[PDB]
Amino acid sequence: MVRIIVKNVSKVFKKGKVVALDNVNINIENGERFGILGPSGAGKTTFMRIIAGLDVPSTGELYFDDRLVASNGKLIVPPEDRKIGMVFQTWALYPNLTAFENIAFPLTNMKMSKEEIRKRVEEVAKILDIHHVLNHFPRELSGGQQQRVALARALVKDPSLLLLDEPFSNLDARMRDSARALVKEVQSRLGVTLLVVSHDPADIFAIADRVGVLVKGKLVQVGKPEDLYDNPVSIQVASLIGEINELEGKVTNEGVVIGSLRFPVSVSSDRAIIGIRPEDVKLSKDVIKDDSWILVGKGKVKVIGYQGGLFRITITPLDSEEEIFTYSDHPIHSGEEVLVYVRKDKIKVFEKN
């Protein structure tokens, strides 16, 4: 319901010594599910606080649709005036207030009569399917119900934008699938623009249609999840977005040499970083007569693992310590020599520092 325009936004702390956000540019579309992925300290929370209006850019500007809301250290439209709902990592329900009371809290100063408050609370409660537990205290609620109450609370003032800062922390994994699914359902039910930030790539593929990767204050790449996955701008982005084998090698006329392996790609540097995802590796004791797979050389199985019903096979090239792992339905025992194949169009390559 609202477009978020971030133009050259920077944010400094410690009187300038720390640059938490550096020249961030991004246009989030109205009604879009947008995600930001980045390691601890990347500046995710700082970013979300600026969007919320709890902080302002040191330099640069922020627009909601065509409305300027903050500019170069100045707050133009305060948080209470932005039509935003928030669930932050530190979020907590007031333990001594019922579910009703928690959801109603934000309406305290909204000039609504008792009946208008009740109606609004019950309406959102129904949407989140917790109308029947409105009289419960948070301790009487399941983990799933607690999140539903927090969401209802964030949505009670009918916002155009919902902000989630690493919300799926209190959950495990069965609960994580459900919580993610709930976020998407609610976004569809209301049409809100959605921004979720996390250090967990699972949260991103699960919820966001477009994602920005944040590293040390810099937004290094923006695109659809699959675009970041297949065409990462760096080896660091490549591994942040998913599992990958990282290999260092020498660039030569034949390609990037790594022990007994030779990758048919190149960079304009002395050495290169090779990135190859597990699904893009295939091991075989015989030559594979299949054009979609490319032989890179001989390898040797170093160790095998088992998890999630699959075997994790780790090899090294001959005359190298570099590791390459991949998953398979069948095991190959350690010490065995094998042929290593890769999906050539899937080899990722970067100049080395």
Ligand SMILES: Nc1ncnc2c1ncn2[C@@H]1O[C@H](COP(=O)(O)OP(=O)(O)O)[C@@H](O)[C@H]1O
């Ligand atoms: N109010 C603060 N005072 C000083 N430094 C801060 C403050 N808030 C954030 N920072 C610093 O800015 C950087 C980014 O912080 P943050 O946005 O919280 O990262 P993230 O949420 O991605 O883990 C960190 O180095 C952090 O220490």
Ligand SMILES: [Mg+2]
């Ligand atoms: Mg944070």
